[PDB]
Amino acid sequence: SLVAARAEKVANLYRWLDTDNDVATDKYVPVPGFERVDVDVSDEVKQRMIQSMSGYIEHTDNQVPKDQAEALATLFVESTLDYDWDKRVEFLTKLESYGYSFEAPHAEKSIVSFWSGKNFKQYRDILDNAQTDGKKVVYDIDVKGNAFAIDLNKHLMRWGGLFLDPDNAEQNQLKSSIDAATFSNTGFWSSVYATGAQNDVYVIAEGGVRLGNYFWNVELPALRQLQREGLVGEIRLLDKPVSEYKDLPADQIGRRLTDAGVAVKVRFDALSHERQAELLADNPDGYKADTLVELDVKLSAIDSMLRESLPFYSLRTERNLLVQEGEEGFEVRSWPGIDGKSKTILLDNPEDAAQQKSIERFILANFDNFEQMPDELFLVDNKVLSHHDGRTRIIAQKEDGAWT
Amino acid sequence: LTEEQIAEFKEAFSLFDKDGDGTITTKELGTVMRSLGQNPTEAELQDMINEVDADGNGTIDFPEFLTMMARKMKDTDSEEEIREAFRVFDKDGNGYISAAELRHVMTNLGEKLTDEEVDQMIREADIDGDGQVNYEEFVQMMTA
């Protein structure tokens, strides 16, 4: 099974992000950002939802077996309300066995894309006839398996909503628990879709990243891991309006999350900032609970931290090199530095931070990529050398750069 | 602007230097500024290309350069920017955030990081061994 493969990939990642916590076990794996809320249920009531579900399944125009309907709904409902990992996968495995493909249609000629905004279709169109390579962008909507899972999930959500009383709020806690559980579903399945991304990936998020949305919480992690495996290249973020990306080549469409300028937004969740903003904005109109509030925080500042904390982290970001300390001397590969070719840099003082910054700046000035670099580089005695067949002293330092 | 401050900027500007004369190519000014510890935006960089006027060949001399660093250095305050960026994941009033909260944040916002690089830093910050982190403390330890 191909989704059991992906599922297994996803279960690791969730367990890797849970290592400090260690709240994950067998069967229960926590979806990042999807708090598990389980409260007491009357047992038979499950059957009410079970048989509703089952009915719904086969009295709907879906590619499911006739009598299989009871089976499916039983599996699904247990799987959701119990936060059982094996059942969640089994449900997914089962669906895959009814000709529900959990994979993008243009298997290799598809650009797996992410939309977590408003008007994906508009963006998608510009993005589609921009590729000069016959490449067509694909959303999670396009995956028949995904969509059908979301449909059934939607139905159980709706059951809770319109069969229950908020008035009696011990009933509300049962509603909040069912809402919480169905939320982790959509969350898990977005990590399934996201582990299938290859090459350059497109992300639609107008007005910057939205902290605590699906992209941030489940998609971006799965995409990060894929990069460190070398399977994904640039994650391109379209946080500006569609016009700004109009009549631009596919390479040049979008930037990175970590670049300066990209904004962050929340749903106006804080105890007293709602009120601060409330009397400072019940002035004109107001704010709905889901209104997105533009924060003034810089994700770039966290990237900046790394550049001044980890050695040669800027060659990584700006030149896609991976300088690691080796047996003696730094060894350099193209990032993520699992691929063959290896070059070397020797410093005359490998721990001095002034020294690392110098050879760092030097490399950014002389080489645009890894393949342009000589096989050996030396920062010695205020001179920089290189050996590539014959030794040359490319620059000397007497308060400046005396190239030659 | 300290005299010390100009010494490093003179040194940084020696390299990147095309014609080896004192001209720095426009596009690379962006790169050089990013190395010297200031991150100007896509638009803000265009300000320095216009605010210091540009009319084609060269014109980005060393004197123009340390003018912007001055300008840019004024309106941006890096240590509070990093503190601000770690408090959004505060959510609890208290200075600490969960080590799992941190790991999640460091993975997303560390683009050319590796799993083991992220593992190592979550251990280093988790002095207490309980699975909580002083976000300031953690900054403090990566400023050394």
Residue numbers in the entry:
A (entry chain A): 1968 to 2371
B (entry chain B): 5 to 148
Task: Provide the publication's sentences verbatim.
By doing this, the clinical strain V. vulnificus MO6-24/O generates a MARTX toxin (MARTXVv) containing four effectors, which are arranged in the following order: domain of unknown function in the first position (DUF1), the Rho inactivation domain (RID), the α/β hydrolase domain (ABH), and a Makes caterpillars floppy-like effector (MCF) with a cysteine protease domain (CPD). Previously, we reported that DUF1 and RID within MARTXVv are not uncoupled by activated CPD in host cells; rather, they are discharged as a duet (it is assumed that the DUF1-RID effector module acts as a functional unit).
The duet interacted with CaM, regardless of the presence of Ca2+; indeed, it interacted more readily with Ca2+-free CaM. Consistent with the pull-down results, isothermal titration calorimetry (ITC) analysis revealed that the effector duet binds much more strongly to Ca2+-free CaM (dissociation constant (KD) = 80 nM) than to Ca2+-bound CaM (CaM/Ca2+, KD = 1.93 μM), with a 1:1 binding stoichiometry. Subsequently, we determined the structure of DUF1-RIDCBD in complex with Ca2+-bound CaM or Ca2+-free CaM at a resolution of 2.82 Å and 2.90 Å, respectively. The structures of both complexes are identical (RMSD of 1.323 Å).
